[PDB]
Ligand binder design. Structure first.
Ligand SMILES: C[C@H](CCC(=O)O)[C@H]1CC[C@H]2[C@@H]3CC[C@@H]4C[C@H](CC(C)(C)O)CC[C@]4(C)[C@H]3CC[C@]12C
Ligand SMILES: C[C@H](CCC(=O)O)[C@H]1CC[C@H]2[C@@H]3CC[C@@H]4C[C@H](CC(C)(C)O)CC[C@]4(C)[C@H]3CC[C@]12C
Lengths: 9, 238, 238, 9
């Protein structure tokens, strides 16, 4: 879930 | 009366809303333009993708959501995103027009416009009826926000491991919600019950949208029109 | 002179070009609008995504490409797409403006506009020099098209299993190309050699773009701006 | 490669 992890910092 | 700790919850939740909801809708001009049959799906997929990012921002400011594990934060968002987007769009839904008005007229969404993004009236009918039922409740902003954090913080969702921590957080929000209506809403003696019904109405809408999205994603000619975030959130990955 | 079978190749290749290249660029208005630092990447990623679809359409009409296995058709496109997009955009590149002109001015792409999609001048410099070198060759349309099918039909590409069948197809195109310049191009006695150089110049541009795309895709804040097709084609999946 | 297969028919 690359973008979700990145969006949650 | 309300606790000082109960009202810091309301303050931080309201502050976390204005941040993530732009009442000028000035970023819609950056979406793939609308066209008025799968027309209008480019636009609406862009719209939804933007909305997910503002939901994630809202979640991260809910007191105690950031303290969960990344697997549970992902899991709650993956199951509740589409419910919160339907929820927060009540602020632009007009009873007079039965449309969402976001500073158009290019951004006025009739039923004819939303029927064109690949979804049947078997989803648009309950959703529009949901929108008038929620707009007729005439919720204060403090109550509209709480219902978002309550809807996000539900543990009866697929993929949650820490059922005890988030239930503890959700219960804390309901007690703040019930107290708010006692003290601050005149004539709300039935209101907490109707709002909790709206949560159950939201689940019927999710289940349907999840059903119709599976038809859209098994057709690559339509699935390539969505954005990479949409594919991740509405995807079926664990 | 040229064979009747050699000119059916040219006819079907030219017919396969007009179909997949719209000289009115009337579908650019459907892209995420341009903004003039990662600005302009939404637009250009949409642009590239549209271009890949027209390349795939062009490939499918190359005589004998459709007869390959799906693994080889995918493999050739995955390695050659970005080369053919740089190739076919020569038709809109202006020597007078040193920009691509697609019916703007919202669709006029200076170097300032293309520097903003996340790529350094270490790619934009060779690409622009490539564009004037190719525009100075003053290729006929028949020769511009052949070079596309030749560039697509190269077997020294990662993932190809049937090196004998596509080499046979590519050689057939070069012989048609060499004959065309003999008979139909006045003063082209050096031209087939300069065009083959352009193929090698295209590989240096691919390698660089593939290098800089890896930096863009390891940053999810930028990778979510691309389209699902782009992610598949430029992806590293087998 | 879902979209590529689909695009190649
Ligand atoms: C315009 C309005 C927001 C206004 C505001 O935020 O202020 C939004 C909120 C709820 C949205 C519907 C949710 C269910 C569908 C999702 C699919 C997305 C897809 C990936 C294709 O499944 C696109 C079509 C559907 C019907 C959406 C249409 C746009 C609506 C009505
Ligand atoms: C405007 C022009 C087409 C005009 C026509 O078709 O007639 C196209 C053709 C070649 C394109 C460049 C290819 C290399 C880069 C690809 C990335 C795509 C990404 C996924 C972000 O890697 C976006 C930025 C770059 C520099 C492109 C910019 C637009 C250009 C110059």
């Amino acid at each position: 879930h690359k973008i979700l992890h990145r969006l949650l910092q | 009366m309300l606790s000082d700790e109960q009202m810091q919850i309301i303050n931080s939740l309201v502050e976390a809303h204005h941040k993530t909801y732009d009442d000028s809708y000035s970023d819609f001009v950056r979406f793939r333009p609308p066209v008025r049959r799968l027309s209008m799906l480019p636009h609406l997929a862009d719209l939804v993708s933007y909305s997910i990012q503002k939901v994630i921002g809202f979640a991260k400011m809910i007191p105690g959501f950031r303290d969960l594990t990344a697997e549970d934060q992902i899991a709650l968002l993956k199951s509740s995103a589409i419910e919160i987007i339907m929820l927060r769009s009540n602020q632009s839904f007009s009873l007079e027009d039965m449309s969402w008005s976001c500073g158009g007229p290019d951004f006025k969404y009739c039923i004819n416009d939303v029927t064109k993004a690949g979804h049947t009236l078997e989803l648009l009918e309950p959703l529009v009826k949901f929108q008038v039922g929620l707009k007729k409740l005439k919720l204060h902003e403090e109550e509209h926000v709480l219902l978002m954090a309550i809807c996000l913080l539900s543990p009866d969702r697929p993929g949650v491991q820490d059922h005890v921590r988030i239930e503890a957080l959700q219960d804390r929000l309901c007690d703040v919600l019930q107290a708010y209506i006692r003290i601050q809403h005149p004539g709300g003696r039935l209101l907490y019950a109707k709002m909790i019904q709206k949560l159950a109405d939201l689940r019927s809408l999710n289940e349907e949208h999840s059903k119709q999205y599976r038809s859209l994603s098994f057709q690559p000619e339509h699935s390539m029109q969505l954005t990479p975030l949409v594919l991740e959130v509405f995807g079926s990955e664990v």
